[PDB]
PDB file of N, CA and C in Angstrom:
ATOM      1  N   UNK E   1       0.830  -1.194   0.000  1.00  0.00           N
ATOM      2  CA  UNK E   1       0.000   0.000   0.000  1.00  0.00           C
ATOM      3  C   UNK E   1       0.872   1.254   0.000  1.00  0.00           C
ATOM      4  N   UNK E   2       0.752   1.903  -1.013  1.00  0.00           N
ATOM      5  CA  UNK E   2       1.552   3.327  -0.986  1.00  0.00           C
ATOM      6  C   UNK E   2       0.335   4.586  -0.543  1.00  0.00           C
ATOM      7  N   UNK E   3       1.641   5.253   0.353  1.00  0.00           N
ATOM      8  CA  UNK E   3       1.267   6.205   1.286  1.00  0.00           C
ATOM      9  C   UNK E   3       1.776   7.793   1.094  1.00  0.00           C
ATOM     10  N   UNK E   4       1.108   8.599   0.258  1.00  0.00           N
ATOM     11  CA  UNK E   4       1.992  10.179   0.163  1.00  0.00           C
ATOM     12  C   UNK E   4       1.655  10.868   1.581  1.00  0.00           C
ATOM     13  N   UNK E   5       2.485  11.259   2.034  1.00  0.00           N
ATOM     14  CA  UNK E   5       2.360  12.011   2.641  1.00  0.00           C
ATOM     15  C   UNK E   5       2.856  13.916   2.556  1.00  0.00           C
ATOM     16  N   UNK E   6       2.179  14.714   2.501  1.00  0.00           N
ATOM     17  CA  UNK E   6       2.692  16.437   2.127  1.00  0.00           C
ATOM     18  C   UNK E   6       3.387  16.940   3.320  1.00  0.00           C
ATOM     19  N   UNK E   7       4.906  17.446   2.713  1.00  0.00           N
ATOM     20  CA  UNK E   7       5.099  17.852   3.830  1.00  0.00           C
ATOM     21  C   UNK E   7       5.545  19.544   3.227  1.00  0.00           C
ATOM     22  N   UNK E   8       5.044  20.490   4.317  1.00  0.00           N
ATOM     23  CA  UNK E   8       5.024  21.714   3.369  1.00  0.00           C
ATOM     24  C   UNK E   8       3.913  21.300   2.277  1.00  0.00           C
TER      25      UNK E   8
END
């Protein structure tokens, strides 16, 4: 399972 996470 792919996970994006935003940083900024």
């Amino acid at each position: 399972s792919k996970t994006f996470i935003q940083v900024x």
